[PDB]
Design a protein around this ligand. Structure first.
Ligand SMILES: *[C@@H]1O[C@H](CO)[C@@H](O)[C@H](O)[C@H]1NC(C)=O
Ligand SMILES: *[C@@H]1O[C@H](CO)[C@@H](O)[C@H](O)[C@H]1NC(C)=O
Lengths: 49, 110
């Protein structure tokens, strides 16, 4: 689990753009206020190789 | 003496700092605790080191490269920008990778 990828973002990267921000993604009708919750998720995932 | 570029300018996400100190130019991309309101006296991922004076600069940010052009000239009518033509020539082409949307300049103060 020492390797990760980003599953969620506001928009696609431009070519050679890079992003290490950890803002919670709002997936739907309820805003997140800086924490995970109902319709609210941390943007990174791990492969578990 | 220099400029700051980024989105937030708060080190929760990345920003580009450029500073001149008369002996050198110093350039950084970082997320350390910088100034609350930037000035000078009279968590990193890139780093580099090198009114009669009209100094002119151009900045642009394309496909992860940040590009700088400049020119220096005297101006005998010092009061405002001169009416004649002159061309700026390239300085540097930096692989900094930031989504820049906002910027600020840096001043020496008492
Ligand atoms: C260190 O960098 C990370 C982003 O890579 C940022 O979350 C954190 O706020 C930075 N530290 C400080 C003191 O801002
Ligand atoms: C300018 O910055 C460089 C890098 O930190 C340093 O070596 C140099 O001594 C500085 N010049 C002055 C006048 O402080």
């Amino acid at each position: 689990y020492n390797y990760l990828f980003r599953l969620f973002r506001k928009s696609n990267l431009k070519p050679f753009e890079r992003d290490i921000s950890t803002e919670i993604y709002q997936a739907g009708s309820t805003p997140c206020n800086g924490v995970e919750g109902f319709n609210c998720y941390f943007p990174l995932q791990s492969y578990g190789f | 003496r220099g400029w700051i570029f980024g989105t937030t300018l708060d080190s929760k996400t990345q920003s580009l700092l450029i500073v001149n100190n008369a002996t050198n130019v110093v350039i950084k991309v970082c997320e350390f605790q910088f100034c609350n309101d930037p000035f000078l006296g009279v968590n990193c991922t890139f780093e580099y080191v090198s009114f009669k004076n009209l100094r002119e600069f151009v900045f642009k940010n394309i496909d992860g490269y940040f590009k700088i052009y400049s020119k220096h000239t005297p101006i005998n009518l010092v009061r405002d920008l001169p009416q004649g033509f002159s061309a700026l020539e390239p300085l540097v082409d930096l692989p900094i990778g930031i989504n820049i949307t906002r910027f600020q300049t840096l001043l020496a103060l008492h």
